């Protein structure tokens, strides 16, 4: 199926306490493969996926160098942004950045993106065409104007439509064994009496990958989306994911409800009846 490579960057200022905390992570779909943490002892980009060790010595040297350059840019920006919003130098502020690319089943470029945020809100993002910018407010406009003159869009486009895709393929191949695998969810249903005349049915999905999944309850074949509780898909810690969805139903009418599980790891969606 389709695939993506994405990098996430976070810088938190600590005025007077130390350098801003800088954390970066790289992903191929839902699999993290590298990380950098300014508080760590290595001060190098580190591996987080077995297959990334297939890369050579120059890879680690280069990615360490580049990631430190990102850290430096984030450090300057924190200052710049503080000024733009006329904020005090004592407070702690955040800068987040995410960029990457998507490829189809043939592993050819589909889309690219580069987003930047300040204190948890959109600040500026590269639009879908990879040639223009969406500036959140008046502050972002100044950066927009700066980045147009410096032809930043052009740099990002070349990377997003080329380098990003090239490496994503490379990683996809080296990690074929696992990245191109689909772990269909192991599912079951629990029936637990709650009220005196009501029962709760919880639909479980476990040990699946990628994290993308859909659990929907139906009654007599009709979607029931207003008497249910859905949890945020969560990481099992071993590479797989988990999720569950429940609905309170009238005791004795359980046979009317069905849980539908959609996951690319399944030939066809699963229908579960207690």
């Amino acid at each position: 199926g389709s695939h993506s490579m994405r990098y996430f960057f976070t810088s938190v200022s600590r005025p007077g306490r130390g350098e801003p905390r800088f954390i970066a992570v790289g992903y191929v779909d839902d699999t993290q493969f590298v990380r950098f943490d300014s508080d760590a002892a290595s001060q190098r980009m580190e591996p987080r996926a077995p297959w990334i060790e297939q890369e050579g010595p120059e890879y680690w040297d280069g990615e360490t160098r580049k990631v430190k350059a990102h850290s430096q840019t984030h450090r300057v920006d924190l200052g710049t942004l503080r000024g733009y919003y006329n904020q005090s130098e004592a407070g702690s502020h955040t800068v987040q950045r995410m960029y990457g690319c998507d490829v189809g089943s043939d592993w050819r470029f589909l889309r690219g993106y580069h987003q930047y945020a300040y204190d948890g809100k959109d600040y500026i993002a590269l639009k879908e065409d990879l040639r223009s910018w969406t500036a959140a407010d008046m502050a972002a406009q100044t950066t927009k104007h700066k980045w147009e003159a410096a032809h930043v869009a052009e740099q990002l486009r070349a990377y997003l439509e080329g380098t990003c895709v090239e490496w994503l393929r490379r990683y996809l191949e080296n990690g074929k064994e696992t990245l191109q695998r689909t772990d269909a969810p192991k599912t079951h249903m629990t029936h637990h009496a709650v009220s005196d005349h009501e029962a709760t049915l919880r639909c479980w999905a476990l040990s699946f990958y990628p994290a993308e999944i859909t659990l929907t309850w139906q009654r007599d074949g009709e979607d029931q989306t207003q008497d249910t509780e859905l949890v945020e898909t969560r990481p099992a810690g071993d590479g797989t994911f988990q999720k569950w969805a429940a609905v309170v139903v009238p005791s004795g009418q359980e046979q009317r409800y069905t849980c539908h599980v959609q996951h690319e790891g399944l030939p066809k969606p699963l229908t579960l009846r207690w």
């Binding site: 990098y7 990615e63 580049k66 300057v76 920006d77 710049t80 930047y116 980045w147 740099q155 990002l156």
Partner: peptide, 9 residues
């Protein structure tokens, strides 16, 4: 692989 550098805002 990362961008070779990110321009300052």
């Amino acid at each position: 692989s990362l961008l070779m550098w990110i321009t300052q805002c």
